[PDB]
Design an enzyme around this catalytic site. Structure first.
Site, PDB file in Angstrom:
ATOM      1  N   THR A   1      -5.680   6.576  -0.771  1.00 50.23           N
ATOM      2  CA  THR A   1      -4.793   7.389   0.035  1.00 50.23           C
ATOM      3  C   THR A   1      -3.576   7.542  -0.845  1.00 50.23           C
ATOM      4  O   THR A   1      -2.581   8.509  -0.777  1.00 50.23           O
ATOM      5  CB  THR A   1      -4.353   6.725   1.330  1.00 50.23           C
ATOM      6  OG1 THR A   1      -3.400   7.583   2.027  1.00 50.23           O
ATOM      7  CG2 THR A   1      -3.830   5.353   1.032  1.00 50.23           C
ATOM      8  N   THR A   2      -3.255   6.904  -1.975  1.00 51.87           N
ATOM      9  CA  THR A   2      -2.250   7.138  -2.728  1.00 51.87           C
ATOM     10  C   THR A   2      -2.576   7.889  -4.039  1.00 51.87           C
ATOM     11  O   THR A   2      -1.796   8.659  -4.610  1.00 51.87           O
ATOM     12  CB  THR A   2      -1.453   5.904  -3.225  1.00 51.87           C
ATOM     13  OG1 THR A   2      -0.246   6.144  -4.027  1.00 51.87           O
ATOM     14  CG2 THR A   2      -2.522   4.856  -3.947  1.00 51.87           C
TER      15      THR A   2
ATOM     16  N   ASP B   1       0.865  -1.163   0.152  1.00 52.03           N
ATOM     17  CA  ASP B   1       0.042   0.098   0.156  1.00 52.03           C
ATOM     18  C   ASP B   1       0.875   1.278  -0.151  1.00 52.03           C
ATOM     19  O   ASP B   1       2.069   1.207  -0.033  1.00 52.03           O
ATOM     20  CB  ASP B   1      -0.993  -0.154   1.185  1.00 52.03           C
ATOM     21  CG  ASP B   1      -0.188   0.139   2.422  1.00 52.03           C
ATOM     22  OD1 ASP B   1      -0.073   1.418   2.997  1.00 52.03           O
ATOM     23  OD2 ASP B   1       0.158  -0.666   3.122  1.00 52.03           O
TER      24      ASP B   1
ATOM     25  N   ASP C   1     -12.183  -1.291   6.113  1.00 53.92           N
ATOM     26  CA  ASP C   1     -12.332  -0.495   4.921  1.00 53.92           C
ATOM     27  C   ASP C   1     -13.654  -1.022   4.408  1.00 53.92           C
ATOM     28  O   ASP C   1     -13.980  -0.121   3.411  1.00 53.92           O
ATOM     29  CB  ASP C   1     -11.019  -0.881   4.224  1.00 53.92           C
ATOM     30  CG  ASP C   1     -11.145  -2.340   3.689  1.00 53.92           C
ATOM     31  OD1 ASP C   1     -12.152  -2.924   3.574  1.00 53.92           O
ATOM     32  OD2 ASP C   1     -10.211  -2.773   2.804  1.00 53.92           O
TER      33      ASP C   1
END
Lengths: 506, 497, 511, 497
Positions: free
Chosen positions: C79-80, C46, C380
């Site tokens: 988030t990336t 991640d 999540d």
């Protein structure tokens, strides 16, 4: 290291002082900013204040700043003028040494130049009318001299109060006064152009309980520093006692002793009482019902200062309290602090001339600083007025006329003291040149125009329009300086230059 | 010395100037994990580390009279810095400083006279007051991101300040920092609000609210002369610490009950065991209070201020008729129903973020201020770049008539004042030179009301757009920038200990 | 000069962070070794687990960390993508300031681009209605089958659907509270035993003599003193014997019963134990006395559990004994300690009245890492379902939103006027890095792949994206990869917000 | 900044402006030569060392202006240098060069229009016009180095121009030079005068001469005789021309007598025997003359080209009213009194050095020029900074009036114009900034005749003082400097090979 090169290094240090004092003299002078290691920043035009903390860079500068500082009470405004004049003396002295003259000979040439300067300066201007009685042309003098520099606007009151204060104390010592009896008490918190005359001493005024109206009925003052008021070692406390009955009995004994010294206070008649300490507020209200002004937080040294002032002797102990010894004060008054929140005590007797101080308001630190500087300058210039009332016609006019006279008398000297005379004349010429350079006028042009105006028109009062007003006659502007101030200026400058020259090594 | 510092501070403040400016980020030294982003140049000037004494004295001379009026800081600092830079150019051109001082004094007199002439009175009409107050609020509340929330601030502040109609209540207005709901809506208190819990231990609708106004609260206990019988004599009896606490509570609570007041307000949080003590004793102590609350109680209901409370008569019987609590936000907030609005007010924002509320409260402080004096005053001037460029045009006009060498200094003053709308345009990204030159033409050929419309970057007839700035803040920023520039300029050399 | 230079430096730092993170994107991913002060290794595919432990010096790096944290707390995944959008927008900004156009116009143009992009993404997405269980399970399986947590998310997805249904009726579009649905562990166990716990799971109790279960439990919220205070020392006098401390010992023995009689008139059943720095003392010699007449002590309560129990059962927060009245008492239906499938002393509260229908899921597993992976999977899953329910109409992923949004944003810049037009064009034609990153991490020629996606979105299907589990551009498979529309909305809005803030930032200053 | 050399090469020229100027030295290149000083920048630019191609272009514009104007090449160069300085300053301000060109062209249009509408035509008058001619010529010649005998030369020039009655003629004056003597020894006299020695052989006592130009003398052994023609042969044609040429001795008299003769003028050497033959015939032929003045001979005397008497009858006679030769102290100078054109006058300056001489004849050319285009087209403007301040005021009014970026560009152009009298005052040593500020204020309040008194530094209404400059030169300086600065600015980079 040694000899003439070491003296040149001294000259460079003097130039370092002189070139920074160059931009500061005159009403239009450029102020410096004073910063201490604490970082506090203040702007000021007063040369004395600038020199008060100007740190040494090379030692002879420290010597000369100490020399200039030592005459602050008499030199008045123009101490920066003294410094720049001496710097010009040394700057032209460097040229004389380049010409090869030994330092002591230019030194005694400068002292005879100062002698002829004094002789001509005694004849340079007329005398103002009487000081002590009429005082109205003296009011005009104080306006046109003091309120022009840095105060928000010139107005009659500060000058009138200052001259009244001095004339209350001016005539006893054969037309003389000492500033030990007159002081300034700066206290920010009020409207800037609000200030009162004080023929006495100012003390922070507290009523132990403000329930009773602001009033004063002074006939005599009880100057006490004894446990009459229950003493405290300046520590916060909230007391407790073994029983409420014990506290009631303690209160009763408190009021019994308060009444017996009421008999002690009323047998001498000191209807006003003061002390460092004070009891609790409710009992203080009861105390005020007994017609004695219980007070608290009175200034420590101030108590004995006012006690010595009022002709009394302070009372530290019960066994030392006698009816005859208390201070026979004339009056006490509630001076409003400008703000409606509080008022101060003033202790004063109009009959006795002593101790006539000034009580001033202010809005900011640097503004009250310049206010006290201006009033001290007023005080010293009016001392020079009272010592003798003939003026000098300052604002560069005195300098230019004196330099003209010295240059005229230069060729009358058969020895190279003649060259020293020329050097002194040029150094005096520098002062109007400085007053133009710091202002917005070409220095040499207007300086020589004033020179020629004095040469062709038979009046030495024509100087440089430092205030930039249309008229150039220094009498017409009525901006003026005392002759005595100029006497001290020239004498201090020549003594300073001669002391610098006589020093040779390290 | 040369004015590098006085222009450096101005340059570091420049990009923040006005709405649609540029942000700054301030971070703590030592590479610790702490920083913040801010747009208000006043925040930078507060947080700046002034290593230059000239910059220090400049920001100090601003602070004495810039944060008072409100929002002037970003204008006064930049105008003073531009004046110092132009004067540095002048002294490079061998113009003596005192000439510049005299020229700027006369030029500022002319500019202030032109501002007074151009200022338009708006008294005696209620609808003109309404529109002017919303416009000035929108121009002063030009800081929040959300435009509907911008309007929320505008309406709330205007309605809070207008309901006075009299001499200033800025001493009594407050903006409560309590977090509420959505970050886009605002509110006002019909009776000033506290963060104090109500109902669990104290009455809900307090009829006959006594409202004793105390300063010396109980951090743990207090004392009264009774003849205590302490059981914790020394280290040998440390287990008896609780013995004197009940006495130190009662010997005050009982006498306050005899005074007739349960509504004990003080700043200090009365603790949980003292919460038991006060609740059982029948006194409703309010553990948060302030000078502002006491003075609002005074102004709204004829009360007064108190201090060092020990004696019952030293504090007022603040006979508020009734007090309730309201349900705004995520707290049970007491709500003083008795002190109605009209004489004073307190604004509260809903929103669950302290840091947003910080810039919020700063903007409402500057607004509430300018609102207060402009209601006390009656005049306003067209804002944006219109007013300052008008004053610059007046300075240019009178400068041409000046015979003395200070004519160049007067022109320099005019150019420096002209630079302010130039910076307004530059921070907004428009063509600065074109905008300012066409504005100079637009209101140099008469047409005095013409201004620069920053909302689209075009010439705008400011008469109908309504973007206006209160006269008092413009006059104050003009005079303060003038005097600060004089102070910074008139010093030529500096020495240090 | 200085403002342009400092903005360039800020942009360079932000772009360095973003491009160091760029390789680790999406389900495929590729990791780095973290440059840290201990020298360990990371195999974390991640992107979040780099920023969350990144040694950051430049304030741009810190602001990108706040960006990633805000994106994660909003919707979790992406988030990336957010940070890579930020980096690409800053690169476009580098180009634009190289040409010299002003930052404020950049901010306004990016705001316009954001508004139009949100409109576009809301437009093309599939307006799936979320009102009943079949729709919820369809959304859940589409969300879980596209990630690597599919193997165990299957059994927990219906239970998460049940929890979110408990929170609100999905006809109410208000977002459910992520923090309200707490996640708890019971030590060890199997996988299937991870079960829904309506009410709350509570910490373990001490069982000297207290009852294990109680019907209609009268839960009390206690935070107050227990004993005569052992205030400063164990003995106050000569230590030959506890002559006077016997008084405070028997005063403990008396105050315990005094407080228990003060309790029984209310009926507090359980005892949440606050720590000994707040409490006077805690020991078996008194806890036994509290236990034997029905006050069960539960160990080491924490503030989050206190807030949760206050929100659920209505017990007001307590700091003293005198408020023992019914305001601090709750009346549940049943409270039991359950130890099925491996013993466990965690107490449960069941059927209590609650304004908000708080619900928790207990997590079990043969290994601690398995338990925590189940926790992050359910976490999540709740994130994605909540960001779907509060915004509806999920969107296909895999760079398809980026391609379609760049295409329509380029044509929007075509029809748009003014200085902002080229800014929006650059925003669009630089935003396409995400599909380029997927192509790079998929082995295809990135530029050719981006061109192929843009061409296929033109004159044809707009849902076509790069498939990460089969390979390459695909249109026939609708279920390439799907994320809630809020994922892309939050990505674009937070990215543009931070980029325009960076543009607004000038002349960094140390305090 | 690429064209800073163009500014610099005019910067080395600003130190020479104004009649109260300040000299420099031309240091001769290499060794074997000596330095010489120079006041006027005309000689500075003439044969100057040039290092920058833009500076070279500025030099070429200066030479072109000097060619087509004459006097005042310093002002064009210094004005262009100031314009380029301000242009670089504006480029630093991120104002594009082409906007500067457009604004500058508009400013020059407005300034030229205002100058034309403000210049004063002395118009239809005689005695007032006489005084005006006197003082304008005196002040225009005062721009040169000469200070003593300006008035005499100017009065003589205006006398010649009044003989022209409007028909401007630079060749009506015959300009002979003679080394040695003093500047006070300079003489004018009416008619056309030759500085040779003719004495009695061709008598100085003759009337109504037939003035011709004939480029072949008796020393030329010219072939065109009544005898054989020109041949190149030695078999039988060796020296028959020597026998033939004896016919020329008598033909040079008899052919002209047959055409009709009272006298004759020849500009070449004549052999002795024809010398006494002409002495017996009554012919006044000059041995040599300034052959560049053949047009002068044709004009003042009415003479025509004789084709070297190859065709004796294709010419017409000249005329005069007397022939004379006078001993002027040391030179026995010939005096053709009152040749056919009465406006003929001959000027000689007895310069001990040739540089005073050359600058004096340059000044005389300038004088005759300005008298021409201020007599046939009578126009003049107040000089001494008055004109520059007036056009700067007009351009500043335009800048305030005009919108767009051009406003700043033309305002900077106006201040660059203001620099020209600023430079004049600075070279004079006065308080240049204060003086130009005073003059600017005088024009702003309104005084189209206000300027600087150069004899003693102060402003003054220049009409009473009588100081002025001719309109044509000032207008051409402005336009040429503007276009030169424009052509320099319109180039960004230089490409070298």
């Amino acid at each position: 290291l040694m000899g003439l090169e070491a003296l040149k290094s001294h000259i460079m240090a003097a130039k370092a002082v002189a070139n920074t004092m160059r931009t500061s003299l005159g009403p239009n002078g450029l102020d410096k900013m004073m910063v201490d290691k604490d970082g506090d920043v203040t702007v000021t035009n007063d040369g004395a204040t600038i020199l008060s903390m100007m740190d040494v860079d090379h030692q002879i500068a420290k010597l000369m700043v100490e020399l200039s500082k030592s005459q602050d009470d008499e030199i008045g405004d123009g101490t920066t003028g003294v410094v720049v004049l001496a710097g010009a003396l040394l700057e032209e002295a460097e040229q004389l040494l380049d010409r090869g003259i030994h330092p002591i000979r230019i030194a005694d040439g400068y002292e005879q130049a100062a002698r002829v300067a004094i002789e001509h300066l005694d004849k340079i201007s007329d005398s103002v009318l009487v000081d002590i009685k009429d005082t109205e042309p003296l009011i005009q003098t104080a306006k046109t001299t003091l309120g022009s520099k840095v105060v928000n606007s010139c107005h009659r009151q500060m000058a009138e109060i200052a001259v009244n204060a001095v004339l209350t104390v001016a005539d006893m010592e054969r037309r003389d006064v000492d500033f030990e009896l007159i002081k300034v008490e700066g206290k920010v918190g009020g409207r800037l152009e609000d200030t009162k005359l004080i023929k006495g001493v100012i003390v922070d005024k507290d009523f132990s309980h403000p329930q009773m109206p602001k009033k004063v009925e002074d006939a005599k003052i009880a100057i006490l520093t004894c446990p009459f008021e229950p003493p405290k070692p300046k520590t916060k406390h909230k007391l407790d006692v073994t029983s409420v009955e014990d506290y009631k009995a303690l209160q009763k004994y408190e009021k019994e002793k308060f009444e017996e010294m009421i008999q002690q206070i009323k047998e001498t008649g000191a209807n006003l009482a003061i002390c460092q300490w004070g009891f609790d507020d409710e009992a203080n209200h009861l105390l005020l019902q007994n017609n004695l002004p219980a007070v608290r937080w009175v200034g420590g040294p101030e108590i004995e200062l006012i006690a010595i002032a009022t002709g009394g002797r302070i009372v530290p102990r019960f066994s030392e309290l006698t009816a005859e010894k208390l201070g026979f004060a004339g009056l006490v008054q509630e001076i409003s602090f400008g703000t409606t929140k509080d008022k101060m005590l003033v202790i004063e007797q109009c009959k006795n001339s002593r101790a006539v101080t000034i009580f001033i308001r202010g809005g900011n630190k640097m503004i009250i600083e310049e206010a006290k500087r201006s009033l001290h300058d007023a005080l010293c210039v009016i001392r020079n007025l009272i010592r003798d009332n003939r003026v000098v016609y300052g604002g560069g006019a005195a300098e230019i006329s004196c330099a003209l006279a010295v240059s005229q008398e230069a060729d009358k000297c058969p020895t190279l003291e003649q060259y020293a005379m020329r050097a002194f004349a040029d150094a005096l010429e520098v002062i109007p040149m400085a007053l133009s350079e710091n202002s917005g006028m070409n220095p040499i042009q207007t300086m020589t125009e004033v020179r020629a105006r004095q040469v062709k028109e038979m009046n030495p009062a024509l100087g440089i329009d430092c205030l930039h007003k249309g008229t150039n006659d220094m009498k017409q502007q009525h901006v003026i300086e005392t002759l005595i101030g100029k006497k001290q200026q020239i004498s201090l400058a020549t003594q300073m230059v001669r002391m610098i020259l006589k020093i040779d090594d390290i | 010395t040369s004015f590098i510092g006085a222009i450096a501070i101005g340059d570091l403040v420049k990009s923040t100037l006005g709405p649609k400016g540029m942000d700054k980020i301030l971070l703590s030294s030592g590479r610790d994990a702490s920083l913040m982003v801010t747009n208000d140049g006043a925040t930078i000037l507060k947080n700046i580390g002034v290593d230059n004494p000239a910059a220090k004295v400049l920001v100090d001379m601003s602070r004495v009279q810039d944060d008072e009026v409100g929002d002037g800081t970003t204008s006064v600092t930049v105008l003073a810095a531009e004046l110092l830079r132009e004067a540095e150019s002048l002294i490079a051109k061998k113009i003596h400083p005192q000439t510049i001082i005299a020229g700027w004094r006369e030029a500022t007199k002319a500019a202030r006279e032109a501002l007074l002439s151009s200022a338009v009175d708006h008294g005696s009409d209620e609808v003109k007051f309404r529109q002017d107050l919303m416009n000035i609020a929108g121009t002063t509340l030009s800081s929040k991101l959300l435009t509907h929330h911008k309007d929320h601030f505008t309406k709330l502040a205007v309605e809070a300040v207008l309901r006075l109609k009299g001499s200033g209540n800025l001493e009594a207005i407050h903006i409560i920092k309590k977090l509420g709901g959505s970050l886009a809506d605002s509110y006002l208190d019909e009776g000033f609000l506290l963060d104090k819990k109500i109902g669990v231990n104290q009455p809900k609708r307090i009829e006959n609210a006594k409202i004793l106004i105390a300063n010396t609260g109980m951090d743990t206990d207090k004392i009264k002369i009774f003849g205590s019988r302490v059981r914790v004599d020394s280290t040998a009896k440390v287990a008896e610490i609780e013995h004197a606490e009940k006495e130190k509570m009662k010997e005050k609570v009982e006498r306050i009950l005899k005074h007739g007041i349960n509504c004990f307000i003080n700043r200090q949080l009365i603790y949980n065991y003292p919460e038991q003590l006060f609740g059982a004793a029948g006194v409703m102590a309010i553990e948060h209070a302030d000078f502002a609350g006491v003075e609002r109680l005074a102004l709204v209901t004829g009360g007064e201020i108190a201090s060092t409370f020990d004696h019952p008569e030293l504090v007022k019987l603040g006979s508020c008729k009734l007090i309730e609590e309201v349900m705004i936000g995520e707290d049970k907030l007491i709500h003083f129903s008795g002190v109605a609005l009209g004489e004073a007010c307190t604004i509260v924002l809903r929103g669950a973020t302290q840091q947003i509320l910080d810039e919020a409260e700063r903007s409402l402080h500057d607004a509430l201020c300018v609102l207060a004096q402009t209601v006390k005053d009656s005049r306003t001037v067209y804002g944006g770049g219109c007013s300052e460029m008008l004053m610059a045009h007046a300075v240019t006009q009178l400068a041409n008539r000046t015979p003395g060498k200070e004519a160049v200094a007067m022109e320099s003053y005019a150019k420096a004042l002209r630079m302010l709308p130039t910076i307004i345009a530059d921070n907004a990204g428009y063509d600065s030179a074109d905008l300012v030159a066409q504005l100079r033409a637009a209101h140099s050929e008469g047409n005095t009301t013409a201004g620069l419309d920053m909302r689209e970057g075009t010439i705008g007839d400011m008469a109908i757009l309504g973007i206006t700035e209160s006269f008092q803040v413009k006059r104050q920023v003009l005079l303060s920038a003038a005097e600060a520039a004089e102070v910074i300029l008139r010093v030529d050399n500096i020495i240090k200990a | 000069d200085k403002p342009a230079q400092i903005r360039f430096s800020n942009i360079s730092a932000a772009k360095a962070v973003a491009d160091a993170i760029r390789t680790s994107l999406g389900p495929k991913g590729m990791d780095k070794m973290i440059q840290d002060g201990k020298g360990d290794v990371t195999i974390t595919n991640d992107g979040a687990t780099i920023l969350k432990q990144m040694q950051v010096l430049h304030p741009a790096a810190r602001m990108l960390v706040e960006l990633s944290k805000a994106q994660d707390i909003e919707a979790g995944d992406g988030t990336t993508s957010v940070v890579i959008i930020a980096g690409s927008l800053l690169d476009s900004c580098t180009k634009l300031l190289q040409k010299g156009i002003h930052p404020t116009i950049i901010s306004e143009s990016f705001q316009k681009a954001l508004e139009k992009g949100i409109e576009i993404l809301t437009d093309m997405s599939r307006p799936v209605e979320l009102s009943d269980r079949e729709t919820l399970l369809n959304s859940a399986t589409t969300s879980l089958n596209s990630k690597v947590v599919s193997q165990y998310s299957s059994l927990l997805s219906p239970m998460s659907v049940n929890a979110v249904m408990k929170v609100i009726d999905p006809a109410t579009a208000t977002s459910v509270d992520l923090r309200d649905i707490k996640i708890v562990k019971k030590l060890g166990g199997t996988i299937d035993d991870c079960e829904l716990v309506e009410g709350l799971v509570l910490t373990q109790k001490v069982s000297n003599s207290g009852i294990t279960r109680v019907e209609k439990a009268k839960i009390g919220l206690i935070q107050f003193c227990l004993s005569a205070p052992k205030t400063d020392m164990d003995n106050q006098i000569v230590v030959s014997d506890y002559a006077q401390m016997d008084r405070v010992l028997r005063e403990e023995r008396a105050y315990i019963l005094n407080l228990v009689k003060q309790i029984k008139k209310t009926g507090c059943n359980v005892l949440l134990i606050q720590k000994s720095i707040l409490r006077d003392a805690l020991s078996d010699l008194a806890l036994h006395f509290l236990n034997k007449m029905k006050i069960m002590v539960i160990k080491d309560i924490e503030r989050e559990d206190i807030e949760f129990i206050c929100k659920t059962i209505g017990t007001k927060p307590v700091a003293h004994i005198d408020q023992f009245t019914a305001d601090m008492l709750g009346s549940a239906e049943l409270a039991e300690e359950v130890n099925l499938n491996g013993s466990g002393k965690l107490l449960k509260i069941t059927g209590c009245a609650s304004p908000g229908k708080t619900v928790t899921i207990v997590v079990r597993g043969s290994n601690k890492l398995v338990i925590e992976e189940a926790e992050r999977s359910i976490h999540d899953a709740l994130c994605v379902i909540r960001c779907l329910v509060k915004k509806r109409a999920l969107i296909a992923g895999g760079g398809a939103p980026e391609i379609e949004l760049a295409l329509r944003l380029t044509e929007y810049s075509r029809t748009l006027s003014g200085m902002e037009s080229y800014c929006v064009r650059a925003f669009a034609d630089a935003m396409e890095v995400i599909p380029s990153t997927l192509a790079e991490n998929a082995g295809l020629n990135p530029i050719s792949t981006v061109t192929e996606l843009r061409n296929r979105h033109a004159q044809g299907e707009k849902t076509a994206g790069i498939n990460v589990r089969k390979g390459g551009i695909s249109n026939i498979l609708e279920e390439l990869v799907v994320q809630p529309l809020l994922v892309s909305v939050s990505a674009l809005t937070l990215a543009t917000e931070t980029v325009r803030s960076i543009l607004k930032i000038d002349d960094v200053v140390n305090t």
